[PDB]
Ligand binder design. Sequence first.
Ligand code: FES
Ligand code: FES
Ligand code: FES
Ligand SMILES: [Fe+2]
Ligand SMILES: [Fe+2]
Ligand SMILES: [Fe+2]
Ligand SMILES: [Mg+2]
Ligand SMILES: [Mg+2]
Ligand SMILES: [Mg+2]
Ligand SMILES: [Mg+2]
Ligand SMILES: [Mg+2]
Lengths: 383, 383, 383
Amino acid sequence: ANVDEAILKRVKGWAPYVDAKLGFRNHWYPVMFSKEINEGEPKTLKLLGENLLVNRIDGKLYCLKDRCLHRGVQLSVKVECKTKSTITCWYHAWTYRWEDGVLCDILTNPTSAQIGRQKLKTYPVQEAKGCVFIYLGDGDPPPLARDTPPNFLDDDMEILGKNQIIKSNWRLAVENGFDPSHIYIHKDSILVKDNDLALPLGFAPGGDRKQQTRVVDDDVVGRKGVYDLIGEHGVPVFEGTIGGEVVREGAYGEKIVANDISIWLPGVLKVNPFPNPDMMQFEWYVPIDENTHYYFQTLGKPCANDEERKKYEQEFESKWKPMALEGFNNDDIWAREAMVDFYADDKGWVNEILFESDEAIVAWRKLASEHNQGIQTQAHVSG
Amino acid sequence: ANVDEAILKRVKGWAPYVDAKLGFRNHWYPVMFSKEINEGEPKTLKLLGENLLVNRIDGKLYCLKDRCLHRGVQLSVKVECKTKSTITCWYHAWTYRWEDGVLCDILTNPTSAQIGRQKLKTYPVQEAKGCVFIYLGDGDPPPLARDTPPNFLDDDMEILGKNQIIKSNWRLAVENGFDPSHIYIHKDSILVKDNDLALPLGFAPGGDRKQQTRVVDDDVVGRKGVYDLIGEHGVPVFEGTIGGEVVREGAYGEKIVANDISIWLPGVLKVNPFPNPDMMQFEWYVPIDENTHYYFQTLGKPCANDEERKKYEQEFESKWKPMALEGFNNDDIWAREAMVDFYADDKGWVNEILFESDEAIVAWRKLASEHNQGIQTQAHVSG
Amino acid sequence: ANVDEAILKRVKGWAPYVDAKLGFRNHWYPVMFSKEINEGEPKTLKLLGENLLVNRIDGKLYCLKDRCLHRGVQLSVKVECKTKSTITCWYHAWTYRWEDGVLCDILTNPTSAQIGRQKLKTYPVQEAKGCVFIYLGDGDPPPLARDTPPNFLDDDMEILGKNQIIKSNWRLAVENGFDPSHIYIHKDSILVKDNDLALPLGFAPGGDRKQQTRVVDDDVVGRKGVYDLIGEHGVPVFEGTIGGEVVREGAYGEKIVANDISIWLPGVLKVNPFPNPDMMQFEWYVPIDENTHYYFQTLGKPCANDEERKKYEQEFESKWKPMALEGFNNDDIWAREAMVDFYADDKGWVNEILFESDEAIVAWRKLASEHNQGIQTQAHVSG
Ligand code: FES
Ligand code: FES
Ligand code: FES
Ligand SMILES: [Fe+2]
Ligand SMILES: [Fe+2]
Ligand SMILES: [Fe+2]
Ligand SMILES: [Mg+2]
Ligand SMILES: [Mg+2]
Ligand SMILES: [Mg+2]
Ligand SMILES: [Mg+2]
Ligand SMILES: [Mg+2]
């Protein structure tokens, strides 16, 4: 639906994934933090190519398509919320209920035949762990757990994070996250030095192809993902050689991190533990449009009470956000940006030359192709 | 030519209008004020996607296509008018007569077989009320009055105006101008408050007078237009309601304006009276290219002598230009800009949901489709 | 390959040239001066649409495609030359030999089956006369002499020059260089005024079409070019007339230059003598992409020894660079930029109206169509 059929015929291992330039419809995605949306302060964002409005009304979140039914303007150009329960388009005052999107009033013509006979698209919205998730899909949503990595929703897991807009397609971000050999780019990170991490340059893979990953397609809340098992039977590379000479060494530190690495539909990485042995990292790559993603980064730590939560918040602000979320992952940002040109014409999916550690990436591409809940298309965006 | 047949086949009754992305050929259009084009000082502009040169020679205006026949450069890159009657291309000195476009000389090769056997396109130009009009069409032009609204050319009518380039397609500007319900956007205007205008939020169409428009096809100079009668025959909304609760009032005021509102081919609105009881507003939305128009605004006031003309100019500079042309119509500008996205892929023409007051807009779309004098195409532009 | 088949059918005689939007493959092209690339300091550039890296190692130049075989990143985003003889991709440390492009190591997986089984594209590089030439083509190259004008490689010919990036297609540059009538644009040049040049406004051609040029398809080293002979039979125009009135004169200077003007594949102009009677100008119009070229200008003067070399370097800096390479050719730069719009859609090749002096340009388009060593296509650029 999105890519030249002639390219899709050349990527038969994972053609639906290559078609999914706008992401997968009918999944939950995080778009902002709960603390960023105040009572009665609607916010605009673009998700899977669609402009949306989110509002908090008596503490509850609601999501309306930011596109008037009448002349297709963004209501957000000039927000008019004239009652708690409604928003009025600024142009001809078509008025919609947040709760169900029904056209309930038109201020410029209270006799219109359109009143009560039209509905603006709404999307389900849930807050969990101080994160705002939108179900960009149609019909009854699944539990949020389906589209979140294991442990993210644990009662005692405290989540703190950072969000920003990155100019690469979401898939280049997912693959960069889940790529076992990309950790070469992190060899000079401040985090690796100041937090004393064991970080190899890469891994010489051991065992058979089928042992390099574990597909999870039998999780009982319907979660679908892949674990990277390259470190299980693989030999970590700490001495980089050219023609047999050592030219580079890996990070010779004491702290073992990233024993468990997994990627989940719709596009969320879990790294456990990271960036410290007592915490884990969960990061989403949320499709905004064909060219752009939200890099929605979270660190989780079990905290038993308000005192542990406060101690974690203080370490997050003082150490883990600047050292790890910024000082380690900033190199991922320009890596993603560097892949844009090759994949921009959809040709890089045919012309890439993969090697052994990309087994993790190919397993993800297949999992995503088989288990996605729909391919978002320009028809969903416009129609 | 300009729009996919898949869209046009879905808009029967006004498909020519939807195809007319670049405007209608074979009409007059205003492009600048007389004072902006000085004797022997050529000016460049783009009209209906064509680059044009205008010059004043012995007081009279001429217009050549700003594209050399030879290698297709704009002559205006380096203007060389070496005699009163001619322009010489800067590149190889092909020399054209302003009066008829004829290639009369080539300075680089006075023996060329091209001399006297080629002609650069010319367009008629006329000045009226201090406004420069170009006939962007072929063959001998109709009278200017065919393409101007009633009274604009009246002997006593003093015209003052403002012109600027706006980044929307021309049709979004025309529809914004003629839209009976869009007056909702003007509810907070300083003009409405300070000049004591009566301005409803909108109109409930009137049950005792069923015809919401009057087509003028029967005019004496052949002008073609539509009068909006909703406001004359409708029930004005001064108390806008949501769930039956008043959430917004209209503007009460002594001064009744816009008794008669009409749109005319090729795309010029007349509002009478406006912004004061003895004035009229005439505004054009002149196509520059697919994405851009001139918003050519004028205010007319009958003036018997130089003292009345002087008083009107003072009034215009101190009050009407800042309060009305800027203050009031600035909200029309961002309204037009806000419609761009929905119409940019041509899908808005199919996906819009109209309501009752849009009968005025559909009447215009059908009038324009029936009585335009030609659809401008890329073949006219490049060629 | 590059242009709508419809257009190519309307230009039959020179269709391969109209197709050659990215330039001709399997030719040498200058891209920088020798003194701009230091030992072990790689430089990036784009040539015929391909991103390339050039390095100097033990004084010798090497050229690798700047696109990793693995995920298609530019290695130049973060250059890692970890041994004298190699470059390591910053992403997964795929390590390539400069000499033959062979993938000789991967630091992230020294056990990979890809090692020794892949090679990055390399291009030959040759330095001559202080200029860096890349053979943008396949297989063992021809002698550089084939792709340089006569006398450029003469033992005693001292070359000095200037390079810059210009926003036009390379062919608009070539035609502007070789066009006999375009000298009209140079009539006010500081070089003409200050160096007392004789410069007509143009020529009235004499003799047959065949007599207006001399095709060199028969040169001993395989050079392919056209001499402009318009001034052999041609009558110089020094009095430009409109309606038989003189409106402009040529330059009546004592100094005679540009006796011999020739254009050579792959797109290099030779003007002898210029800008003074014992110097030659050799200038290349090197394709960067569809929209861009290097304007690689050089001035040659024969010098017997180190002392003549130094005097020429001084007059180049104080006189010839500013007065000629800038004061004369700057008008050529904006002339090229002015042709972009008409040729951007490929329609100008069909819609232009040529005149008699364009027989030089037609002879070049025919020579280029017949004798080019290959049409660069998006398949070469992409894969
Ligand atoms: S575009 Fe929203 S009410 Fe008209
Ligand atoms: S482009 Fe105008 S005379 Fe050649
Ligand atoms: S992209 Fe260069 S080594 Fe992976
Ligand atoms: Fe990373
Ligand atoms: Fe308005
Ligand atoms: Fe020149
Ligand atoms: Mg709801
Ligand atoms: Mg005329
Ligand atoms: Mg009032
Ligand atoms: Mg008055
Ligand atoms: Mg080599």
